[PDB]
Amino acid sequence: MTTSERVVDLLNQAALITNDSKITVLKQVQELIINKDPTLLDNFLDEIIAFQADKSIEVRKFVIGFIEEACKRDIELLLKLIANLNMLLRDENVNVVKKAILTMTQLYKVALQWMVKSVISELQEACWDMVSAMAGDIILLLDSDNDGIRTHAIKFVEGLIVTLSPRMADSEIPRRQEHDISLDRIPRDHPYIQYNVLWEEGKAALEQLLKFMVHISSINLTTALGSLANIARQRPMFMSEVIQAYETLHANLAKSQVSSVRKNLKLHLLSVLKHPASLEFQAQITTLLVDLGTPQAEIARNMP
C-alpha cells in the first residue's frame, strides 16, 4: 500500500484500541509522516492531536512529544499546535504537565528565533502572544505544590533567562546551545517583539528564580544552584546576582540535608570561580568558599 494508505489504516486502528498499544501504532504513524514522507505531516495533524483527550497519561505524553517532533520538522506548525500544547500544559495530571514543560524548554527558543528571522503575520503575532503567556505560566509553576513540576520549571526558567539576555564575549556556551537565539540577536526595532520587554522579562525571571531559592525540597534547591551556575557562566553579566544568591543561602530545609546542600553549593561556586568573569568578585567568592569549609588547595585549583 502507499504511505498515506498505511497511515489511514494505522490511525483507524489506533482509534479502536483500548490500551497503551495504541501508542505503538501512533509511533509508527509518527515515523511515517515525520521521516518516511515528511509531506504527510501536515495532512494528519488533526488525527494525531485528537488523542490529546485520551484518558491514558502515556497517550497524552505521546501527543506532547509528537507536537515537539512536528515543530522540530516544521516550526510553522506551531501556529496549528500551540493551543493544543497549552491545553496539555494545563493537564490535571502532573506527569503530563512535566512533559509539556520539557517540550516548552525545547520549543520556546525555536519559536522566538522563528519570529525574529521572519515581516511577521497576524497568526504569528497571536502565536507569539500565546508562547509568551505559556512561558509566563511556567515561571508560575516554580510555585507548584508538586516537587517534580518545580524542578522541571527551574530548568525552563534557566533557559528563559539565558534566551532573554545577551551573549557576552566571555560567555561559556555549551556546544549543544551554540546555535540557540539570544537577546543580542533580537532587533531593537522589530515590528512586534519588543526588545525592552524581553530584557525585562529575562531579568524578572531571574528575580523569580532568586526568590524561589528562599521559598522547597533539597532537589529543587540543588537544581536551582546548578541553574544559577550555568547562568553565571553563560551570561556573566549576572555573575554578581548569582554570587549574592549563594551568599544569601549560606547566611540563612531538614538540617540532615545541610552537608549535601553545602557540598553542592561548594561545587557550583568552584565552577563559577573557574570562569574568567569571576575575577572582579574573587575576594567575595574566596571568602565564601572558606566559610563553606573549602580547603585552600581546592580553591587554588579552581582559579581561572
Side-chain angles (χ1 to χ4, degrees):
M1 60 190 48
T2 69
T3 309
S4 60
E5 284 168 349
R6 179 62 175 166
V7 169
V8 167
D9 245 80
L10 289 167
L11 288 163
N12 287 161
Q13 291 177 232
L16 298 174
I17 286 165
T18 59
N19 55 66
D20 281 351
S21 66
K22 68 186 86 182
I23 302 173
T24 306
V25 178
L26 292 172
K27 285 173 173 176
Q28 292 174 46
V29 171
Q30 177 178 257
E31 186 180 300
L32 291 170
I33 71 180
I34 299 198
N35 301 284
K36 189 174 210 168
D37 184 0
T39 73
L40 296 177
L41 179 53
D42 274 13
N43 297 125
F44 292 100
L45 292 182
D46 291 333
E47 288 84 356
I48 296 281
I49 304 294
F51 290 87
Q52 80 173 104
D54 197 285
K55 294 315 284 169
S56 165
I57 280 57
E58 296 297 322
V59 174
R60 297 202 302 279
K61 289 171 58 186
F62 165 83
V63 174
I64 298 168
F66 173 80
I67 291 171
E68 189 178 325
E69 290 293 307
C71 294
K72 292 213 169 150
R73 168 60 71 205
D74 182 2
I75 191 58
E76 186 169 4
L77 296 179
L78 198 54
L79 300 178
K80 296 179 183 201
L81 297 174
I82 191 66
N84 301 282
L85 184 61
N86 188 47
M87 295 168 208
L88 287 151
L89 183 59
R90 290 172 182 178
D91 204 89
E92 73 282 3
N93 179 280
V94 297
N95 298 316
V96 179
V97 174
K98 288 166 208 178
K99 175 70 166 170
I101 296 171
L102 288 182
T103 289
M104 276 289 293
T105 303
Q106 299 301 306
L107 288 187
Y108 177 93
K109 64 194 182 182
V110 180
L112 177 56
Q113 171 191 158
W114 182 46
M115 297 302 169
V116 169
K117 253 158 179 197
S118 290
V119 169
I120 176 171
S121 79
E122 302 286 314
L123 297 170
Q124 280 178 298
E125 295 175 338
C127 180
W128 181 250
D129 290 347
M130 180 163 295
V131 170
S132 184
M134 288 166 69
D137 283 346
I138 300 168
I139 300 168
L140 303 174
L141 294 175
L142 294 170
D143 251 279
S144 176
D145 293 320
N146 181 271
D147 189 51
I149 286 176
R150 295 186 300 258
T151 296
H152 283 68
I154 293 163
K155 298 299 294 186
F156 176 79
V157 169
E158 178 196 331
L160 187 70
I161 294 160
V162 172
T163 300
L164 299 187
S165 56
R167 277 177 64 159
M168 307 265 87
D170 60 347
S171 290
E172 184 184 343
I173 309 297
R175 271 182 92 84
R176 175 185 316 183
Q177 290 174 77
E178 177 62 36
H179 313 116
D180 290 351
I181 198 80
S182 53
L183 192 68
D184 50 289
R185 287 172 310 270
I186 301 188
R188 267 196 191 259
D189 61 349
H190 188 86
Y192 199 73
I193 182 129
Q194 296 183 37
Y195 181 98
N196 295 351
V197 173
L198 291 188
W199 182 290
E200 294 153 351
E201 184 80 11
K203 292 250 58 199
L206 174 62
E207 304 215 342
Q208 294 301 307
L209 186 53
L210 304 168
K211 286 184 193 220
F212 177 83
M213 286 267 319
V214 176
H215 258 22
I216 69 167
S217 67
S218 289
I219 181 173
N220 296 156
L221 181 59
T222 58
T223 301
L225 288 175
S227 286
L228 291 172
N230 290 350
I231 290 160
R233 289 178 290 181
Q234 292 176 35
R235 297 292 186 274
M237 344 90 113
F238 296 129
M239 186 64 86
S240 193
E241 287 90 334
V242 168
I243 306 302
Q244 187 56 67
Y246 291 170
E247 288 181 315
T248 292
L249 174 59
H250 184 239
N252 300 313
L253 75 72
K255 286 187 188 189
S256 66
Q257 281 292 107
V258 169
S259 293
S260 290
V261 170
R262 191 157 294 160
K263 177 168 188 196
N264 189 258
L265 172 62
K266 289 160 65 188
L267 288 170
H268 290 305
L269 226 201
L270 288 162
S271 86
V272 173
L273 182 61
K274 197 163 179 168
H275 189 287
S278 73
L279 285 222
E280 268 174 287
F281 311 95
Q282 207 181 62
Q284 201 182 351
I285 294 162
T286 288
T287 296
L288 222 196
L289 283 164
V290 170
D291 278 350
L292 290 166
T294 315
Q296 274 288 338
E298 202 169 353
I299 302 178
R301 297 175 224 144
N302 283 278
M303 288 286 190

